[PDB]
Design an enzyme around this catalytic site. Structure first.
Site, PDB file in Angstrom:
ATOM      1  N   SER A 130       0.843  -1.188   0.000  1.00  0.00           N
ATOM      2  CA  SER A 130       0.000   0.000   0.000  1.00  0.00           C
ATOM      3  C   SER A 130       0.881   1.241   0.000  1.00  0.00           C
ATOM      4  O   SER A 130       2.100   1.145   0.130  1.00  0.00           O
ATOM      5  CB  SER A 130      -0.874  -0.017   1.260  1.00  0.00           C
ATOM      6  OG  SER A 130      -1.431   1.252   1.550  1.00  0.00           O
ATOM      7  N   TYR A 183      -2.705  -0.829  10.148  1.00  0.00           N
ATOM      8  CA  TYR A 183      -2.618  -1.131   8.723  1.00  0.00           C
ATOM      9  C   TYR A 183      -1.255  -0.697   8.183  1.00  0.00           C
ATOM     10  O   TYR A 183      -0.591  -1.448   7.466  1.00  0.00           O
ATOM     11  CB  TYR A 183      -3.734  -0.398   7.979  1.00  0.00           C
ATOM     12  CG  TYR A 183      -3.904  -0.797   6.529  1.00  0.00           C
ATOM     13  CD1 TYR A 183      -4.639  -1.929   6.176  1.00  0.00           C
ATOM     14  CD2 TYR A 183      -3.349  -0.027   5.508  1.00  0.00           C
ATOM     15  CE1 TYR A 183      -4.824  -2.280   4.835  1.00  0.00           C
ATOM     16  CE2 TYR A 183      -3.526  -0.370   4.169  1.00  0.00           C
ATOM     17  CZ  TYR A 183      -4.264  -1.492   3.839  1.00  0.00           C
ATOM     18  OH  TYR A 183      -4.460  -1.814   2.513  1.00  0.00           O
TER      19      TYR A 183
END
Lengths: 228, 238, 238, 238
Positions: free
Chosen positions: A128, A143
């Protein structure tokens, strides 16, 4: 003839990647809680699973048997608890790290011996923009940590399995369509978010012969976001 | 249909990239001092030029006229002076920085307008493991500096030309088997320590690097820009 | 005047950091399984604890009560299971990930409110060259993953607590001469290939690493946060 | 005792660094077009010079003579041409690259022998957030390229001179209030988008950057070399 397992392959990026692999002639198995429609539409083998619960190596074994071998592993299963660190419980922090990171390790560890037996393998973890940043205006410490952790796992497994014919890489999608939008989009040179299929094109490359000498790397497909 | 110009396309990594693009169906032009023979085996258009001295935009203009357009630019010209900083002369420093960096800027600057009018373009600069390290047992400060500088130029141009339909990336090859790297490969004191750090345990064939270059020169890179992509058999990750 | 807690503070890097902070006039508390000897030599408060088995926030509470406040947190506790991924058990993976990463999060989470109360705080996580590489000849996939993960946590917490007056950074030591790394030094197959990549040609004293840790725990870091700072004798740059 | 030369030392970051070094007890010389007033205020030796045209090595020679030796070199001179690549001329490109990069190489090359002689040296190049990004809303391709190139040069020189007792690093300041950056602060479409990405919610003061520069020019950096250290209020981590 190449056999692939894609977790989280019924929706978003996972689905796009599964479709891209089928298009390449790979025999694909899609794992998610309700993979029926996706498997039917893409022409893949459905493997209903709850990866926050089920034993990862158990899934690999199921894929191996359903596909008659295993050469490619793509871990796109997702989950997240959007809460700042001071509000996050240890349980929530662990929930995120378990599915993103621990399951990534366990799935790869289980799949590696079968790729080695074939003398050819591709492991693709999904990163990401938070693999390189903190997510900006969004509070996602768990995350961010998990996606950055994957870069380390990617380098570690790539080093260890290179001689086995296995390549391990981390695909880091930018902002994809699956007070916050405007600022973020302004940092994207291309001026728009990505289509899942645009991310999948690169995933396919990292899952094929093009990556014969490419391993232990993160590849960001973000419309120029990180470079901005 | 897509039109590409590859500098340093008569041998080494450049030739492999030109070959890969021709295989993708691109109309390719290769530039080097004497590309005639190489071009004919490759099935490309030869553009004789000395990029260490000839005006870069002059080359782009010739490529545009020979190809009937220009969509892809790959700057793979190679050169190096393997000397430590305290021994290196400013002229030598400039020779390396000019060909690898200044020329990259000039070629890209000249090619961009043509890509913009086509509404689609791919600029591929060539980095190195020295884009992220200092070359290890090899004394190459000028080269390291230039190849690292390219990462900055890559991000800068990618940001500026994204809306024009142009993608700019930096392909970073690892240790590749070429006449250019022969002084390194033949010498155990250099080859052994370097190879011990390559997880795959071997140097790459130029064609293996070209596979990725082709991707960065095609539709696969539609949403990929301003990035360095290292193809090094695991060297940097080691 | 500043109150600091250093885990793994009775040996190696942790002890060196504790000594450097005391030298700066900080009131320091060190936590380890047997901190008595080190605490009385350094002039610090001993906090006997098994960081792999005792509740992290409980340690923070003990430190707060013993120091009468808390401004600085340094998590220098060390542990490792040097086995390749295919030989590693999930329990071993979890042992390493828990101590290095989960505990880092838990300790920081428990300490932040106290730093915010004071309007000034410093959180220093300890990384490694494996925050940027895979450890080379050493089989340490769990350790590498945890130390790389810390860079993400560092950025995330730095962003969240920036306006509270708290700075969060990751000190990444290179190869340091400690009992923790003794196994690396005793095997030529690890020591030689690694040291050949250290420009300074030597491993670094714990005290040399602590000099930088002290900076990151002081006013010098007023505008420095969310970053990794590598102190490796040139290893990564090589 | 330690003798230091700071280019661009009459204003902004350069001046702050000079002042910080004087405070550490160093004998400082500051180089700029009109350093007379700053030198007198700071208590340093003034060395009038135009680094965009004067031979860099002549400057080092002058510093050596004025200070009676040379242990530290800080290249903080600043210049820029904020124009996009398609509007930038080659002369402007070269102006920026020459001052920021070529001069960095020339100054370091000339100073190194003197540091090696002393067996102790510190070279501090000045980077930017553009060493890692393309500058966001600001059109600065040349500056970005030069500041990123410096990371390569930093690694290269650090590797080559480590055994001579010289440490070479790149201090990368974030957004600092200086007259050099005035044009950014004066236009909301640059200042707002940029500042929104700084977790600390404010630009830095030159002195806050100098605090870290001083560390990188002292014994604290004994085992720290070939690295970039970003002091940006959390900008890059955002």
């Amino acid at each position: 003839e190449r056999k692939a397992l894609v977790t989280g392959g019924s929706r978003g990026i996972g689905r796009a990647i599964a479709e891209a692999l089928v298009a390449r002639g790979y025999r694909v198995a899609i794992a998610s809680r309700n993979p029926e429609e996706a498997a039917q539409s893409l022409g893949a083998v459905p493997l209903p699973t709850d990866l926050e619960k089920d034993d990862p190596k158990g899934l690999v074994k199921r894929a191996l048997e359903a596909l008659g071998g295993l050469h490619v592993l793509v871990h796109a299963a997702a989950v997240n608890v959007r809460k700042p660190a001071l509000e996050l419980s240890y349980e929530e922090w662990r929930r995120v790290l378990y599915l993103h990171l621990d399951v990534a390790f366990l799935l790869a560890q289980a799949a590696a011996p079968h790729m080695a037996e074939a003398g050819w393998g591709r492991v693709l973890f999904i990163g990401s923009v938070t693999t390189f940043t903190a997510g900006g205006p969004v509070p996602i410490p768990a995350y961010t940590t998990a996606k950055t952790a994957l870069l380390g796992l990617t380098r570690a497994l790539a080093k260890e399995w290179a001689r086995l014919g296995i390549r391990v890489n981390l695909l880091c999608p930018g902002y994809v369509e699956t007070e916050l939008y405007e600022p973020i989009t302004a940092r994207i040179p291309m001026g728009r978010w990505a289509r899942p299929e645009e991310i999948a094109r690169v995933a396919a490359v990292l899952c094929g012969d093009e990556a014969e000498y490419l391993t232990g790397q993160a590849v960001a497909v973000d419309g120029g976001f990180l470079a901005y």
